[PDB]
Paper text:
Structural comparison reveals that the Caci_0382 structure in apo-form and in complex with TMA are very similar and could be aligned with an average RMSD value of 0.4 Å for individual subunits (131 Cα atoms). Two cadmium ions are bound to the surface residues H61 and H74, and one to oxygen atoms of the main chain of residue Y114 between the protein subunits.
Caci_0382 is one of these genes, which encodes for a 134 amino-acid putative protein with a molecular weight of 14.3 kDa. The three-dimensional crystal structure of Caci_0382 from Catenulispora acidiphila, described here, reveals that the protein forms a homodimer, wherein each subunit contains the NTF2 conserved structural fold with a similar binding site to LEH. The protein structure characterization suggests that the Caci_0382 structure is similar to LEH and that it shares a similar binding cavity with a conserved group of residues implicated in LEH catalytic activity.
Residue numbers in the entry:
A (entry chain A): 1 to 131
B (entry chain B): 2 to 131
Write the structure that this text describes.
Amino acid sequence: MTTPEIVTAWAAAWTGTNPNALGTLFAADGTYVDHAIGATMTGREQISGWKARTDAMIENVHVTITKAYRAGDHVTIEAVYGGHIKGAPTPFAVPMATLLRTRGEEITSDQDYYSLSSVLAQSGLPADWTP
Amino acid sequence: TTPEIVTAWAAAWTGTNPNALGTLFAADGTYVDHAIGATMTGREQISGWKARTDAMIENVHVTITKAYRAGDHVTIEAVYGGHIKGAPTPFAVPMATLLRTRGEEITSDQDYYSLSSVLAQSGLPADWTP
Ligand SMILES: [Cl-]
Ligand SMILES: [Cl-]
Ligand SMILES: [Cl-]
Ligand SMILES: [Cl-]
Ligand SMILES: [Cl-]
Ligand SMILES: [Cl-]
Ligand SMILES: [Cl-]
């Protein structure tokens, strides 16, 4: 029912145009893993850099919260991730599952899962497409 | 502490009995595999998804890394492994499974994992389909 503020902040950081708004949420040794793409970042500079890299490749990145729920230091997010890969025929929107581990307000771990096949198919890109 | 429903779900996926998976679900329960894009509703179809998976993949096994419950919601961090029949090599990948429960029954299961990692580990092309 009630969405944790950290979830709202995470979505706003991904939907905005400010890489540091994402990185600042993370611990100094915090990790970020995108399992769909297979990218791994550690620390705020690299994590803010992942928002920057994503924006460089994808226009109009936006993340909306479907629902979220906390169990102790763990937060689960069901979201929709959308955008338009620059140069691709069409945009995409897919469900995503994000698992956070937190310490107070700080994020120590973020894992993102979503269907890369669905992203590419919606986008009109080949199934084996790479940037 | 891992919920018993999580242990049961892993044992169903790791075993050789399709009905052990389906019996865990409500009559109108849903199962979505986002990596492959498959949707099933009801125990017969859900059991059938275990059968279909086993027909395509040898030694399917699911191990629990950690799991947690928030109300009627359970999150599972697991490792999903097996060997796609005919592929050069086996695979093992992390998976995130989101359950919605009612008592012991599962009303919704969503599975997420990297299909690109599955295929790459397996020695299959990136645009490989059955
Ligand atoms: Cl909730
Ligand atoms: Cl909810
Ligand atoms: Cl994924
Ligand atoms: Cl834990
Ligand atoms: Cl826990
Ligand atoms: Cl997925
Ligand atoms: Cl995927």
